[PDB]
Amino acid sequence: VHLTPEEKSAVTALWGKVNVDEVGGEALGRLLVVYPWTQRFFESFGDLSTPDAVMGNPKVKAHGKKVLGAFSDGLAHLDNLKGTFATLSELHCDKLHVDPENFRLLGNVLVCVLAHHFGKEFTPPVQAAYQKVVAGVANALAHKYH
Amino acid sequence: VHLTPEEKSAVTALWGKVNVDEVGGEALGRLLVVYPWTQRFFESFGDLSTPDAVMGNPKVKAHGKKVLGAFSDGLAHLDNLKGTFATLSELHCDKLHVDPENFRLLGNVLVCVLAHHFGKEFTPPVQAAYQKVVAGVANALAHKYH
Amino acid sequence: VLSPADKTNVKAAWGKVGAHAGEYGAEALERMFLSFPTTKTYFPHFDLSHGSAQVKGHGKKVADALTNAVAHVDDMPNALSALSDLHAHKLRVDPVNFKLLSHCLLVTLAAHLPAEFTPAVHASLDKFLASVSTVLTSKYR
Amino acid sequence: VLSPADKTNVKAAWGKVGAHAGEYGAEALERMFLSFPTTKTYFPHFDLSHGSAQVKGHGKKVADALTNAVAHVDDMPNALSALSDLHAHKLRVDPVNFKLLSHCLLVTLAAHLPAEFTPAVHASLDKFLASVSTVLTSKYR
Ligand code: HEM
Ligand code: HEM
Ligand code: HEM
Ligand code: HEM
Ligand SMILES: *Cc1ccc(CO)o1
Ligand SMILES: *Cc1ccc(CO)o1
8 A cells, every 4th residue: 555654644643543342343433333234244242133232232342452453553654464364365265265346345344433533534635545545455455356 | 366277278269259350349339338437538539429330330340459459468367467458557546547347347247249240159158258358458458556 | 216117027037947946945055155255155055066955956946935925026025924933033044145146146047047137137137136136135034 | 036025125216316316326436446447448538537517516426327217117128218229239347347336325325324225225226236237237228
């Protein structure tokens, strides 16, 4: 991924304000609510039967912290995303068989969560930079499918 | 992409019977009819206003010959589709900005045209082998997006 | 959204399919399971072997659903409400798999209808199958 | 296909936009043009700079078309027929671009209406925008 120096700085400054304990669970929860077929991959998490049950599910919140840490790793390795996510790609592709369009969906849900949390601070130029990041992460995760 | 040795034999055996002068134009023509937003990329080709115009359009037929020739090249280098399609990938992604979902659509229209020509000879196992090929071609063409 | 010409083509083409609809439904399933083996995860208890009586019986069910949708083409959400609950609410089928089966149905029709699978018919059937897929993947009941 | 709960959620959330229509539509367009520069190809005659008066006025037309779509949620092919003719017949907009603008509209709503943009409402607005997009990309006359 190619971010300008200004984009990298704006992305980093915003990400430093992200609640590491909550934003991942919020993004994963909204994926399961907005795109309910993704719940099929997470039946072991228990009750996902209503939006409130999804968003309040402790297994969703706990796994979301791991998802967010993977995005954090991507942000620390913007020039080598494919190597950073090689093992995650084999897991999601060779083992879980997640259709890669869903990678794009989670990235865009994360963008919606950042916009929801930061309001007017999530400016169009900051979003543009985050779209490059989440596209890179999704491409890297889909790399082993190819 | 992979393809078992039996899948490789079935694919090349069928392709030896494909008419190189017409099948590419039929696939491109049906893409323009079935997915009409794709006509936006072909304004220099002339009248595309009816299915009869599309399927009889001389520029569609001539260009389709080149498209089919690119598929033939892919079939000759199944273990290096990415390199084989490198020049076309920069053309379609960096110059034309064709959305890569359309590569998958054209590959699947080609599969339909093969089934149309070969009938019962286009068995489920033969189709399954061609789906690996056209997925590999589409991913290779989209490489400059990755 | 189907045009009047689309609806004409779909009713005509599915008429030409005729009594072979159940066979073509079974052939489309077999094509899908072989070409896109990830779809087999939705059918863990099925005999998915070539020519299994279970897949042939399920293909008849899929085809009869499509025949009903053709007959109710102006009112598909109402016609397909129970199937939508099954696929979208209970089974949670990823919408990508509907594109796969729809494609395999189109391949099956192409393989069996060399005299009638015109470009216009191909285009109209694609829109019909996409519309059915939207209904079956929507939670509205 | 939208549920009764979906329509309730979309009317409730979109009704709060009100006179922000032009500002919020312009913001969604600006987000799209900056985030996905390939979309700019459809607007060659446009000044696309940040505070462009062209984008501000076009954004109001888009937002108001959505308000009209919300009012005619049960009747969108009829209500949006002229827009479908524009986007599908004349402009030939690639369907992918509707997903991009729809996402940028959700981002814009999320940035401005945090209390309203719940997971359930997010989900309903996504389906609504997907439904609008299907109409605008279909050639049904
Ligand atoms: C950018 C997108 C994504 C990222 C960064 C991501 C990241 C991760 C991470 C870090 C793990 C934990 C791996 C481990 O414990 O070794 C994981 C597991 C998993 N992911 Fe993803 N993921 C993404 C998208 C998706 C999507 C879209 C789906 C399905 C729709 C999915 C399904 C799963 C499942 C089922 C697991 C295992 C959960 C469990 O049973 O504990 N992932 N992912
Ligand atoms: C997916 C398989 C595809 C293959 C194998 C393929 C192959 C080719 C080839 C061989 C050329 C000629 C390059 C040259 O002469 O230098 C070409 C050009 C072109 N392709 Fe594709 N193509 C594919 C898909 C598409 C799709 C899906 C679109 C648009 C919807 C598209 C749009 C174009 C255009 C606009 C040109 C230039 C035509 C002109 O104005 O001369 N291609 N392609
Ligand atoms: C045109 C698209 C489709 C149509 C018209 C259709 C129709 C049907 C019908 C009629 C049934 C039987 C209903 C009953 O027994 O009460 C059924 C069941 C089922 N369908 Fe579909 N279907 C479609 C696509 C799909 C796809 C793409 C998948 C997954 C890849 C899928 C997975 C299933 C499963 C798992 C069952 C239950 C089988 C069982 O346990 O007996 N369907 N569908
Ligand atoms: C929810 C989705 C959309 C809605 C509701 C919408 C609505 C509208 C409206 C109301 C107009 C103006 C009608 C008039 O002034 O007479 C318009 C024009 C236009 N739209 Fe869209 N639109 C949508 C998506 C898109 C997308 C995704 C693109 C391409 C990226 C696009 C490209 C255009 C263009 C090029 C025009 C003509 C502008 C001009 O030259 O005046 N639209 N649309
Ligand atoms: C009429 C129509 C074309 C495509 C779709 C998807 O629901 O619907
Ligand atoms: C009702 C509904 C949800 C998604 C779509 C796409 O046309 O329609």
